[PDB]
């Protein structure tokens, strides 16, 4: 199974006074392991998972230095983009950057990404071959030409194929008891009458990890979406996730209906029935 390391950066300009609000988080798969918050007192990169606390003072000093450099790059960027898009200094604006890498089941580099947004829209993104750029508009074209001239892509690719994968590998190992453990969804079905003649069947999946999952309803062995309901997948708060899916059915006919659960932790999909 592949694994990913992603870093998420958000800078929000504060036109009234001061520097932008800047928040960085780092993830392995669906597990946040570090953060930086400019509003916080420490002005340090901080641990958010036990297995990263293994790292010594020099790791935290290095990460702190780099993430601080990141904050300033984004501050500069917010100014430059205001200029590109001819905006006043009155409004608050947002720059987001996400980058990271995947390793495959062979534990080797699988893919890399580096994506940039301004005010919640695509601005510029490294392409899958990590050698060129997708520019969304004409302002991003400037950035693209500037970055081609300074061969940023070559430098990024070096990071995404070397340092990035190397450290994902290290983290995967150190945190193997959680990061490499799948939590199969604990499933069950509930049932309650909505009338004398109808009932809602709700198929629950709880406490699963990673987030990726599919719940599907069937009637007499064919997919049914009509008269069904659902929630988007949600964090339980303890590092695991939850989802459910419901159908309304004629009462007495509950046995026709099956809930099917697909998840990595499940060797084979699970079929739940009322009774």
């Amino acid at each position: 199974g592949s694994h990913s390391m992603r870093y998420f950066f958000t800078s929000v300009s504060r036109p009234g006074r001061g520097e932008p609000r800047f928040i960085a988080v780092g993830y392995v798969d669906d597990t946040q392991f570090v953060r930086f918050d400019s509003d916080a007192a420490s002005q340090r990169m901080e641990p958010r998972a036990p297995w990263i606390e293994q790292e010594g003072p020099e790791y935290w000093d290095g990460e702190t230095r780099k993430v601080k450099a990141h904050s300033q790059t984004h501050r500069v960027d917010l100014g430059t983009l205001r200029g590109y898009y001819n905006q006043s200094e009155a409004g608050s604006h947002t720059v987001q950057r996400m980058y990271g890498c995947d390793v495959g089941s062979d534990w080797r580099f699988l893919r890399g990404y580096h994506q940039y947004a301004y005010d919640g829209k695509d601005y510029i993104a490294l392409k899958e071959d990590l050698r060129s750029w997708t520019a969304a508009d004409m302002a991003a074209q400037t950035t693209k030409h500037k970055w081609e001239a300074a061969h940023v892509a070559e430098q990024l690719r070096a990071y995404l194929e070397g340092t990035c994968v190397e450290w994902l590998r290290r983290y995967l190992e150190n945190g193997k008891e959680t990061l490499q453990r799948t939590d199969a969804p604990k499933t069950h079905m509930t049932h309650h009458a909505v009338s004398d003649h109808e009932a809602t069947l709700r198929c629950w999946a709880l406490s699963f990890y990673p987030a990726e999952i599919t719940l599907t309803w069937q009637r007499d062995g064919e997919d049914q979406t009509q008269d069904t309901e659902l929630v988007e997948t949600r964090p339980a708060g303890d590092g695991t996730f939850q989802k459910w899916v419901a159908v309304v059915v004629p009462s007495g006919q509950e046995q026709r209906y099956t809930c099917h659960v697909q998840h990595e932790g499940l060797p084979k999909p699970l079929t739940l029935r009322w009774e």
């Binding site: 870093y7 780092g26 990460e63 780099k66 790059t73 430098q155 990035c164 190397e166």
Partner: peptide, 9 residues
């Protein structure tokens, strides 16, 4: 581990 090289837009 974050990178590593910083470049402005």
């Amino acid at each position: 581990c974050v990178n590593g090289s910083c470049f402005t837009v």
